[PDB]
Amino acid sequence: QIHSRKMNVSPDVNYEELARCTDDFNGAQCKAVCVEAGMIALRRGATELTHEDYMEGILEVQAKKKANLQYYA
Amino acid sequence: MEEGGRDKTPVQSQQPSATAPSGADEKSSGKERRDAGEKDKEQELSEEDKQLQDELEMLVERLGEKDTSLYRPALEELRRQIRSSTTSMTSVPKPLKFLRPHYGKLKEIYENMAPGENKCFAADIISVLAMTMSGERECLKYRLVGSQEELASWGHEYVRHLAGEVAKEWQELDDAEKAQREPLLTLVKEIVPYNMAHNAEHEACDLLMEIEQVDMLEKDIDENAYSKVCLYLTSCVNYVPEPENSALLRCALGVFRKFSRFPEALRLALMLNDMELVEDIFTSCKDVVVQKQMAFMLGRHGVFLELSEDVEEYEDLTEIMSNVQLNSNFLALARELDIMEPKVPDDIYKTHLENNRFGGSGSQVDSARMNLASSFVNGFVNAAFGQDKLLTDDGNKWLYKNKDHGMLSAAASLGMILLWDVDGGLTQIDKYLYSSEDYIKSGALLACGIVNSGVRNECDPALALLSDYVLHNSNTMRLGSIFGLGLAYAGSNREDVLTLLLPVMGDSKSSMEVAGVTALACGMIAVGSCNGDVTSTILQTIMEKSETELKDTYARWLPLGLGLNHLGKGEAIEAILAALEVVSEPFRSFANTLVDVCAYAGSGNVLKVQQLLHICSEHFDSKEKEEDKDKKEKKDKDKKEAPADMGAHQGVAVLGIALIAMGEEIGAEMALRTFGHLLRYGEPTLRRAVPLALALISVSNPRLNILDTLSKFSHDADPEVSYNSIFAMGMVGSGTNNARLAAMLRQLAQYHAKDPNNLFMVRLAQGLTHLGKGTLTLCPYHSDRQLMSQVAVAGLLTVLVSFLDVRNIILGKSHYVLYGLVAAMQPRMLVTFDEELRPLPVSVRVGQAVDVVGQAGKPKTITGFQTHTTPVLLAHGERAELATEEFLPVTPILEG
């Protein structure tokens, strides 16, 4: 709620809403995903945020070395 | 050794076979030597053929190994055998065959021993052998390039052979086109460009260009190899005199203008000094390559790139001539015409002012020597063109207040500050031209010459305005007008400019003493083009010296003009000389002597020899004194020769001052004073050291005026690195105060050096190569030898007018902005094999914006991996563009 005032946050998903499906996460984690979600959006050239920017955000935190979710389909 | 291998049938002998030609073979050595002579050819012909195949095979096997112990003695022993009598005499087919591996054997010796003797000997054998074999050398090289393996050693060896052909010791045109040079250029860029440069093999490369462009693009750097051929060619003056090289540069210039890489062509036209050549460089690019691309564009772009001296377009031989060819070139008549007009190159300079800011803090303060001091200072802070506009607009303080010669001096320096205005500076000069005494109007005229060059290109010319002005009955106004004329044209050949010089200063009887500068202005037009050949300048100088040599200023200027009018050519001087003889005096005998020196001048070894038989260290009265300093400088020559010869010139420049001091004691003070300008003309490879060393000492020695001369070069690259140097100089000047007269010279020095940040640097180089000519450096250069420089002479001396244009980035596909554009930097350099000195187009990405520099900027290149392209204009940013040539007619490299 404090964060939404400063930068845009999508109707589609809020970190609170996101947490329910997943599990618990720490407060630094919640702000970091959020800044990162904006980062994709800034890069595109939009001030608006989408749901994809946040989901991409979870993926941005994880490690990668074979980048495939069609083997982990 | 290990006898037998191939002359033995068992399975085992294959190992000794590689080794064996080092000591001796059973029959294989003998096949070419013993067996061929002793027996008759036809009986022998069956055996030799079988064995021939096996020697070929051994060559391939030796390349398989990496060892030199097995490579070198093995091929050497085989040679001797071939030489004896399988050279041309066996038959029609058999000599072609024997000759094919013979070439291979030869390369290693040619390449390895470097000496002059070895060099000539190999050419003798190679040429006769080439003719008989008739083209087998070409297949041989190509097979070797393919191979399966070879040695690193061999890489150097195969190119070296191409040099035997170029000499033509037994050739004259038969196999004087390729030894398969093309793959050979690609692999290695080293010995092969020298061979090409001398042969005139360089013609074939245009036909080959279509294939080569792929390799030049992203795969290799074939581009480096051709730029090298050009280095060797210009260097050839130093190697062997100017008359010998002159024929050569003409044939080299035609192949390069036809080639896609335009800067190389541009350098050579600039050296020859001819009207015909310039129009061809402009037109040829467009015609050879019909595709729009860069090709149409390269003609204009090369003229803008050319930076040697003066204002827009610079040389200005080229500006008049490129019209008529303009209509034919047809990118569009309306647009091409507008780009060529100096009105478009003026606008961009306006933007650079903003960046530079005010530097002005100088005196404009009234009364005394300070009023005279003020006028030179206002320009000197913002040298070339900067934000000095406020001060220039203000008429009242500086211009009007001066008295006598001071008024002419005040007006004359004004034009140089107003430099590169279409108009609005012209409004300003015209307003003075009408007002006040004769001194204001005449002074106004040099200044007029400067601003009006802005609207030209054969529509409303600079010539048009100046033509009315010259007519003036008063000596002073007419002088200032011709001086103004000379300044605009710089070094051109044109019917009108020559015609205005023909009657003017038709007497040695003149009221003022600055009448002599007429002769200089005329002298300037002659160099940097086809000579002026004006009668007034030649005839008058001998009469002037006979009435008077009492005025040190007057006496000096007329023979200085004579020595410059003759420069540019040897041939032309003969017509004017022929006239002079009609009037005979003792004075004339000396005039004649100067013509010998003038024709011979610019040679790399002739000129040097002449200086034992000198006109320094002699006075015949004081006749000898006037030109003796001029000879010693060799200043044209120093600029003219390659980047490689600059390293040498740094000693030469100093050497010439030393020479004057030794010869003539009085001449010693003068020599030091010339020095500051000598370096300015020279634009040496390393600029930092020389002026600073001089700068401190020049306070102690009589005539503080040396220090003023020093300051012109001394600021070097404008303050980033120079911040320490410009601050220290200014302090040395300001620190010592002993008189108002001394203060003023030192005050000129302080203020010149002290230039605000990011400003146009001291240059007469091209900004790819330190190649060029100077006929604008000449206007101070001449007046820096006048014994105890007057107020009147100071005025002539003040103008810069030669410094950089702000655009050092894309001209491209029609851009002409200062607005940023990306560039690539190579942290890992390989190249020192490009004359211009641009490292690989494989690129690592970095940010936008290349702005004026003097020295450095060599690793700075333009990206050519972002969408894969190769630079036509070899990029450094000094006055080198970040522009590329690709198939497409629009830059795939988009503005940052």
């Binding site: - | 990496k66 260097s235 130093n238 100093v654 050497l655 001091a661 003070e669 690989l840």
Partner: protein, 385 residues
Amino acid sequence: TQCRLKLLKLERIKDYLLMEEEFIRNQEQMKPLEEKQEEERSKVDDLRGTPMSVGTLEEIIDDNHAIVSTSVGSEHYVSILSFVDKDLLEPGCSVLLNHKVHAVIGVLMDDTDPLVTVMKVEKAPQETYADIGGLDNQIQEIKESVELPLTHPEYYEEMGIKPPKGVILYGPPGTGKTLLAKAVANQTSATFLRVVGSELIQKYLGDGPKLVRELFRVAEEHAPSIVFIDEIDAIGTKRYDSNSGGEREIQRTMLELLNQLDGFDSRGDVKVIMATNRIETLDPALIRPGRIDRKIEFPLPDEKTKKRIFQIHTSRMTLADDVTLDDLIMAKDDLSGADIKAICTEAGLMALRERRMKVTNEDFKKSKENVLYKKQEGTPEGLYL
């Protein structure tokens, strides 16, 4: 080619003659060099005087000052003396300071350390090239990697790759891995620096990575170079527990060599030939492809390769018909190059015990037993075969 030699010569003639001409002539005529030229010579010479303290130039500061640390136990932020240049003091070189008031009089010394002396090793070997027989293929591989880009770097850097560097020498130990680096080094004519991998970890704390920097820096300056690093296998195999630097020391050393090699440094002309036992006992940080393009695995030396090496040693040894080469080679199995060397060295030694200066078939037969046991020993192996 010849014409070029004249151009190069052209710069150099002017440099000696000009310096000579100017110094003497210009003090004589007017006031150019004159009072100023004497003044620099004299002032520096007087200030320097007796004594001068030696210091080392740590850093140069842009404001006519420098950080010199002096060999008197005090550091100084000196002021430059009139007529001495700040920018002629190399960070490689130590500078001389006047010891009364600290200002840089000048550089008469660059000074020297025992630290330099380790990296620089001069080779003039008893066995060299054409003193090795057999295993001919293995030498050709080394050369394509080391010799060919080092001699002619121009194509190799130009094509787009970084130049292929070095070789890794592994397989059965004893093949003659050490002889090979020294022999190839003479042919290429590269400055041969030898430094042990175990020598880099030592008691001293923080000296360990500094030394590795020096090893690379010196190799680079020398110009064509090969660094043969003998027994590098050593850092990995042992966690020494005898250094006060500890496990910390081993870590920090291991990274620095990687940094100096390529890294962000990306030094060129420096080939490293690595001698190891095996590269399966070597540390996994160090090993990785693409710093060393080619790896060579020697086969077990056969009976055939062995004869050629022995003929050379027989030539170096006392000559007789009592030298019986074949018998010793045959008896032995498919085993190292080293043994051929060991049989010859033990045979001479053995002679001295007898009070004989002769090396005969008897010394050799006795030598065969000891060499064979020590190296690998055939009587275990005969059961398994």
